[PDB]
Ligand SMILES: Nc1ncnc2c1ncn2[C@@H]1O[C@H](COP(=O)(O)OP(=O)(O)OP(=O)(O)O)[C@@H](O)[C@H]1O
Ligand SMILES: C[C@@H](O)[C@H](N)C(=O)O
């Protein structure tokens with residue numbers, strides 16, 4: 013029996029956050045916005061409560077949870093060996109960055125980290141998330157707000173498709189600013205490793221970390237619509253793809269919109285952050301539009317479109333290179 017409470021993203025009503033904090037203290041799961049995607053969270057120090065996240069998501073046990081913190085003092089309670097990277101953390105936090113550290117053990121139970129010695133920490137640059145964590149008093153473990161394998165929720169309409177009647181409370185702060193999950197950098201090995209591309213762009217990370225490792229699984233083929241996804245890297249095969257796949261809807265850009273039948277304009281190449289903001293919404297609009305096949309234009313493997321292509325490659329049923 014779900015409550016949806018609208019709050020301002022800048023100065024949220026602290027009475028709405030106290031109610032969410034109370035539900036977290038009772039070991040309940042709630043949904044809250046961040047600058048990236050909506051989160052489905054619980055008390056990171058509550059084993060049983062975090063287990064409910066796994067069940068609500070329909071999620072495998074061996075997939076660990078990102079712990080959300082509000083302060084550098086909380087980092088010190090949960091992680092160790094970060095001291096040589098504090099300059100870097102202080103430069104990107106709060107913000108759309110998740111880092112892997114060696115766990116300080118103590119209170120973040122094994123279920124949160126899938127029995128791993130590492131923990132993924134994020135200090136989100138969203139006043140609602142920051143003020144909820146500070147008021148609750150404990151860090152929040154939160155995957156993206158979606159059924160496991162589905163596109164990450166970027167607004168309350170999507171949360172509701174996935175979770176109406178399953179959680180007591182959804183905080184609504186509207187459309188998430190970025191539409192894409194946080195960059196994930198692992199800092200626990202000889203050289204830093206990019207595990208997930210996001211709003212902290214690869215190009216920026218390569219400027220700071222010349223020796224950054226970007227693994228094959230990041231550049232090659234979660235986030236899946238209900239109808240089969242055809243990704244077209246080579247846009248000269250677009251004329252040919254549309255034919256091989258008759259019952260189609262297209263997702264294209266503003267500049268190529270007037271060149272298709274049933275088409276959803278995800279955004280413009282003039283403003284590529286608009287593409288990243290709306291891509292997940294586009295998969296959800298498209299799967300509803302009652303066509304057999306969803307057909308997506310590829311983008312430049314550069315800037316934020318790098319992260320978009322990363323998401324669409326893992327979504328795709330076929331990639332047309
Ligand atoms: N300690 C860790 N070491 C490495 N990767 C981690 C660690 N903790 C979390 N991660 C990764 O961070 C990501 C968090 O994303 P999220 O929880 O939204 O799940 P997901 O993989 O997108 O699956 P779903 O479809 O269920 O949302 C996962 O890929 C998870 O494995
Ligand atoms: C919920 C949101 O913070 C997500 N886990 C991310 O890392 O972007």
Ligand SMILES: [Mg+2]
Pocket residue numbers: 155156164
């Ligand atoms: Mg996810």
